[PDB]
Write a protein that binds this ligand. Structure first.
Ligand SMILES: O=C(O)CCC(=O)C(=O)O
Ligand SMILES: [Co+2]
Ligand SMILES: [Co+2]
Lengths: 207, 206
């Protein structure tokens, strides 16, 4: 008897209020789902541009408080109608209220940059682990000429960037060994560049 | 790790007439989800060809699909379209089109399925002298619900999406790797499922 998952959409599409998302493939335990048609091309481009501080003194996401998680690398977007619209769609996908999301986090990889394998949930006895992360949505905002795979090294599987698509995965299982298998990284970009939006989702209301 | 037939290491496969998208990979045994394999028009035309073929061959017999029997009536007749598609496929699969059996068409209506099976033949069968080594399953339409291609020993499934495909191979020296490619077509629960399949042999098959 498999454990319950947060994501429980049973078909080949997720009908959200403003967009029909395609369920492409999935690995079952832990649950890793490739999703098509998550963002339009225009939404992808706008999220990239919104992430830019453009050498000004104020960092994008400056409207976030000392209770907010702060990202050294990349930027959390400031809330607006677009991010709210997208967070609502993502909430239908991830089956959790948008109030549990940390907000759209944008990251750029230049050529040869990578993200070493890591967990998205916080350390077990950490303080952040009181309202720990339970699931991730990584959205590909552009096409990557070569490289840039999201790889899960303990599962020997990867998802390749494709503009408008996403990879979803969760790690709220009671057998910790399942959460351990969501170890993942971003492979080096070897030609071109890579842009992603990540939604990290908390067990409890976050914002 | 054993070398795979499928050689493509980037995010796209550039064929003569089409740029295929590599969407995701399970490494061992190798299972690859491919985008943009067939245009919408190619999918639509393959289905119309199948309807003619299934009708003219008076095919469509059993309740569910079944790997015991032959299925000659469900291979499309060779024409310009099919040759063009097999040429593309051969660049994807990295095996000459002369090793392919040809575009085999299957249709599933509600509650029909294809129970888990290996595509390759058992050792010492007569077909094992020139055994199948890899499969490409192309989704020719969208399926309201159900109809996933599933691999039960790997807990992995590919959902039908018009124009996409799932590639997998089973030519490993480690027989346990080949046995992990056990796979089936899950019941359609809403709508209907059309696929084309290319099975590729170790040696020439033309
Ligand atoms: O219908 C499916 O998804 C699987 C098809 C299949 O098993 C085959 O053609 O070899
Ligand atoms: Co991560
Ligand atoms: Co099969």
């Amino acid at each position: 008897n498999k454990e319950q998952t947060i994501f429980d959409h049973k078909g080949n599409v997720i009908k959200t209020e403003d967009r029909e998302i395609q369920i492409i493939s999935k690995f079952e335990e832990p649950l890793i789902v490739v999703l098509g048609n998550v963002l339009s091309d225009e939404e992808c481009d706008e999220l990239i541009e919104l992430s830019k501080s453009k050498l000004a003194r104020s960092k994008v996401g400056s409207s976030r408080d000392v209770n907010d998680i702060r990202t050294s690398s990349g930027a959390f977007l400031d809330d607006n109608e677009l991010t709210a619209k997208i967070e609502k769609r993502i909430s239908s996908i991830m089956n959790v209220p948008a109030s549990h999301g940390e907000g759209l986090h944008i990251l750029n990889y230049e050529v040869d940059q990578q993200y070493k394998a890591h967990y998205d949930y916080f350390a077990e006895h950490s303080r952040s682990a009181a309202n720990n992360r339970i699931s991730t949505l990584v959205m590909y905002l552009n096409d990557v000429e070569e490289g840039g795979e999201t790889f899960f090294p303990k599962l020997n599987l990867s998802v390749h960037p494709r503009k408008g698509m996403a990879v979803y995965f969760e790690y709220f299982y009671q057998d910790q060994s399942l959460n351990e298998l969501t170890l993942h990284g971003g492979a080096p970009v070897t030609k071109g560049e890579k842009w992603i939006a990540t939604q990290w989702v908390r067990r409890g209301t976050y914002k």
